[PDB]
Amino acid sequence: LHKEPATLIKAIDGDTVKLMYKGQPMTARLLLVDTPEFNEKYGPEASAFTKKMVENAKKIEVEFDKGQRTDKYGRGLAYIYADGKMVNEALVRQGLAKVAYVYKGNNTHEQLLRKAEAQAKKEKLNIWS
Ligand SMILES: Cc1cn([C@H]2C[C@H](OP(=O)(O)O)[C@@H](COP(=O)(O)O)O2)c(=O)[nH]c1=O
Numbered sequence: 001l002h003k004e005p006a007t008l009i010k011a012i013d014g015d016t017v018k019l020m021y022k023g024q025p026m027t028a029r030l031l032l033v034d035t036p037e038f039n040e041k042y043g044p045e046a047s048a049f050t051k052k053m054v055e056n057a058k059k060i061e062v063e064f065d066k067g068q069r070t071d072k073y074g075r076g077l078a079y080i081y082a083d084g085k086m087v088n089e090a091l092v093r094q095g096l097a098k099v100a101y102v103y104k105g106n107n108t109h110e111q112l113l114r115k116a117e118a119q120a121k122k123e124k125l126n127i128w129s
């Protein structure tokens with residue numbers, strides 16, 4: 001896998017961000033995770049976390065996995081990094097997302113995110129509290 005540069009356009013919610021990628025807008029949905037809806041517990045906290053992470057980054061990168069790059073709603077599917085830190089992993093490690101939507105052939109970072117989830121769960125953080 002490889003990390004490609006992109007520019008933040010706007011944060012959207014806990015697991016969706018709008019990026020300028022190769023000069024065109026992309027609504028990127030984070031691979032392998034599920035954040036609560038804004039009307040669910042920890043929803044606002046998940047949105048706030050991702051917004052702060054992407055808005056404070058000097059450098060955002062997009063990394064597609066090996067399988068499909070667009071979902072059935074027209075969103076890009078990727079791992080997003082903010083100054084070298086993966087947003088997908090950070091959300092999970094904070095108990096603000098669960099590992100979810102794990103489809104064959106787009107699951108490179110599955111083990112990594114499940115490690116994170118295990119720690120968040122042990123710590124009873126947020127969703128796991
Ligand atoms: C993360 C991810 C979501 N999706 C789709 C599945 C869900 O639509 P379906 O329920 O109609 O199958 C939806 C959930 O997105 P959100 O959690 O953003 O609402 O996004 C993918 O198809 N592939 C993915 O890798």
Ligand SMILES: [Ca+2]
Pocket residue numbers: 015034035036037
């Ligand atoms: Ca969601």
